[PDB]
Design a protein around this ligand. Structure first.
Ligand code: HEM
Ligand SMILES: *[C@@H]1O[C@H](CO)[C@@H](O[C@@H]2O[C@H](CO)[C@@H](O[C@@H]3O[C@H](CO)[C@@H](O)[C@H](O)[C@@H]3O)[C@H](O)[C@H]2NC(C)=O)[C@H](O)[C@H]1NC(C)=O
Ligand SMILES: *[C@@H]1O[C@H](CO)[C@@H](O[C@@H]2O[C@H](CO)[C@@H](O)[C@H](O)[C@H]2NC(C)=O)[C@H](O)[C@H]1NC(C)=O
Ligand SMILES: *[C@H]1O[C@H](CO)[C@@H](O)[C@H](O)[C@@H]1O[C@H]1O[C@H](CO)[C@@H](O)[C@H](O)[C@@H]1O
Ligand SMILES: *[C@@H]1O[C@H](CO)[C@@H](O)[C@H](O)[C@H]1NC(C)=O
Ligand SMILES: *[C@H]1O[C@H](CO)[C@@H](O)[C@H](O)[C@@H]1O
Ligand SMILES: *[C@H]1O[C@H](CO)[C@@H](O)[C@H](O)[C@@H]1O
Ligand SMILES: *[C@H]1O[C@H](CO)[C@@H](O)[C@H](O)[C@@H]1O
Ligand SMILES: *[C@H]1O[C@H](CO)[C@@H](O)[C@H](O)[C@@H]1O
Ligand SMILES: *[C@H]1O[C@H](CO)[C@@H](O)[C@H](O)[C@@H]1O
Ligand SMILES: *[C@H]1O[C@H](CO)[C@@H](O)[C@H](O)[C@@H]1O
Ligand SMILES: *[C@H]1O[C@H](CO)[C@@H](O)[C@H](O)[C@@H]1O
Ligand SMILES: *[C@H]1O[C@H](CO)[C@@H](O)[C@H](O)[C@@H]1O
Ligand SMILES: *[C@H]1O[C@H](CO)[C@@H](O)[C@H](O)[C@@H]1O
Ligand SMILES: [Br-]
Ligand SMILES: [Br-]
Ligand SMILES: [Br-]
Ligand SMILES: [Mn+2]
Length: 299
């Protein structure tokens, strides 16, 4: 928000306003990076981004400590080298390359379509990067009529997304990605669980309106009482939440789940790509921004 507005105070004492991305700006498949870039906490054009810029942006503006993004930084740079064909040093070329499929970006996302979702021909691909309202609605519908949800609910959401994706994706495309997805499940708990409840740290419940605002608007739900977690969330919280989601008993089982969907997931690890492997072409769509309504500088 506008620095003088004091909307972030006393959690964030140095805010910057929301500015919609323009057609030439680079955006990510990540709702967090996109929100940061929309505020200029990382470059508004989404290009030439250092590790420290990301670290400071997450820590100072979203209450996410360095430990939370350690692997994510490593993997961002692995993907940058893979896509561009050379080492990216400490300047991530852009955000858009992070939507390279079957890499850091993955199938069965909560709010994005898959790279080959619903395509008639094997060579076709679609926008697996920008926010997709319909896809996100398939996630929200699992918790329809509710204001909050718990670990077991999140487990049901990711299962619904896996089932839909396995059914809709071009045959042979679908590839399950429980370890990366469920770090992101833990990220959702870390950012938008309800810290106003007494047992938040031990038993976090996602506030659905906060989650919807963040994902749909790619800006921060201050108007709904949200603020950056204080103290900043650490990696322990995230991976514990990840484990808890996958540990939670399944009471409704969708059909067409891939093998071993239900049960513990592997620890997320650094990505690696063979030098002989050429990257898949990136979707070229202009960056998404909220238009129903469009957002003001304080939104
Ligand atoms: C340098 C740090 C980060 C990088 C490079 C990064 C990268 C990515 C990428 C490539 C995806 C796409 C995966 C897919 O859904 O197919 C993604 C998704 C996601 N990211 Fe980030 N991320 C970072 C930090 C964070 C943080 C700190 C949060 C919140 C605390 C966050 C929240 C999410 C969520 C919730 C998704 C899933 C979106 C969906 O499934 O629709 N990210 N991220
Ligand atoms: C973010 O950065 C990525 C990585 O550099 C950009 O994707 C790449 O964009 C270039 C164009 O600048 C594409 O190069 C073209 O490739 C075709 C076919 O290989 C060739 O005939 C053209 O002469 C040109 O070299 C490249 O394919 C593409 N990489 C991938 C894997 O899709 C991306 O455009 C950047 N996005 C933004 C919004 O900045
Ligand atoms: C995206 O942000 C906009 C702007 O903050 C939200 O619009 C507001 O919605 C609330 C209800 O929750 C109203 O009190 C305000 O009057 C709205 N303002 C405008 C301009 O409409 C919008 O709800 C957010 N989107 C989501 C899905 O959370
Ligand atoms: C992205 O741009 C490419 C050309 O630069 C197209 O060939 C791709 O099909 C893809 O097109 C989509 O996104 C662009 C934004 O650059 C739109 O202009 C198109 O209408 C399309 O949605
Ligand atoms: C914001 O400023 C107030 C008043 O000086 C201070 O008490 C608070 O610690 C600051 N918040 C942060 C995150 O530094
Ligand atoms: C989240 O983190 C837990 C613990 O590392 C994993 O089991 C899960 O698969 C996801 O990566
Ligand atoms: C989540 O999982 C990691 C291992 O993946 C632990 O290091 C952490 O303490 C938390 O349980
Ligand atoms: C790891 O940490 C999470 C979040 O604090 C808990 O919910 C979980 O039970 C485990 O202790
Ligand atoms: C990972 O961690 C979670 C939360 O502590 C457990 O519920 C799960 O069984 C696994 O050990
Ligand atoms: C975990 O527990 C639930 C009940 O909470 C069962 O429905 C499920 O089959 C699993 O054993
Ligand atoms: C078991 O409980 C889950 C949520 O924990 C529901 O989504 C499901 O329909 C069943 O009642
Ligand atoms: C739905 O069905 C699966 C397997 O049939 C169970 O693992 C799950 O607990 C739920 O009952
Ligand atoms: C229980 O919930 C699952 C996952 O959301 C559905 O696939 C199933 O139809 C039932 O409603
Ligand atoms: C987004 O842009 C629209 C213009 O259509 C305004 O009406 C709105 O206030 C917001 O700034
Ligand atoms: Br670029
Ligand atoms: Br489809
Ligand atoms: Br796994
Ligand atoms: Mn995806």
């Amino acid at each position: 928000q506008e620095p003088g507005s004091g909307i972030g105070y006393p959690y964030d004492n140095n805010t910057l306003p929301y500015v919609a991305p323009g057609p030439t700006d680079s955006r990510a498949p990540c709702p967090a990076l996109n929100a940061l870039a929309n505020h200029g906490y990382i470059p508004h054009d989404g290009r030439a981004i250092s590790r420290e810029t990301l670290q400071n942006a997450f820590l100072n503006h979203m209450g996410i400590a360095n430990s939370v993004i350690e692997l994510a930084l490593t993997n961002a740079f692995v993907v940058c080298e893979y896509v561009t064909g050379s080492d990216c040093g400490d300047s991530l070329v852009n955000l858009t390359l992070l939507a390279e499929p079957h890499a850091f970006e993955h199938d069965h996302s909560f709010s994005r379509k898959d790279y080959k979702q619903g395509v008639a021909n094997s060579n076709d691909f679609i926008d697996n990067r920008n926010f997709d309202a319909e896809t996100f609605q398939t996630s929200l519908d699992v918790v329809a009529g509710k204001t909050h949800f718990d670990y077991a609910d999140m487990n049901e959401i990711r299962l619904q997304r896996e089932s839909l994706s396995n059914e809709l994706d071009f045959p042979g495309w679908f590839t399950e990605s429980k370890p990366i997805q469920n770090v992101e499940s833990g990220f959702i708990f870390a950012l938008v669980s309800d810290f106003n409840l007494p047992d938040n740290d031990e038993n976090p419940l996602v506030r659905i309106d906060w989650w919807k605002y963040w994902f749909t608007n790619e800006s921060f739900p201050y108007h709904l009482g949200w603020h950056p977690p204080s103290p900043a969330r650490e990696i322990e919280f995230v991976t514990s939440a990840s484990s808890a989601v996958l540990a939670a008993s399944v009471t409704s089982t969708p059909s067409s789940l891939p093998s071993g969907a239900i049960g513990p997931g592997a620890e997320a690890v650094p990505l690696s790509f063979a030098s002989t492997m050429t990257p898949f072409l990136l979707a070229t769509n202009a960056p998404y921004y909220a238009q129903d309504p469009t957002l003001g500088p304080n939104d």
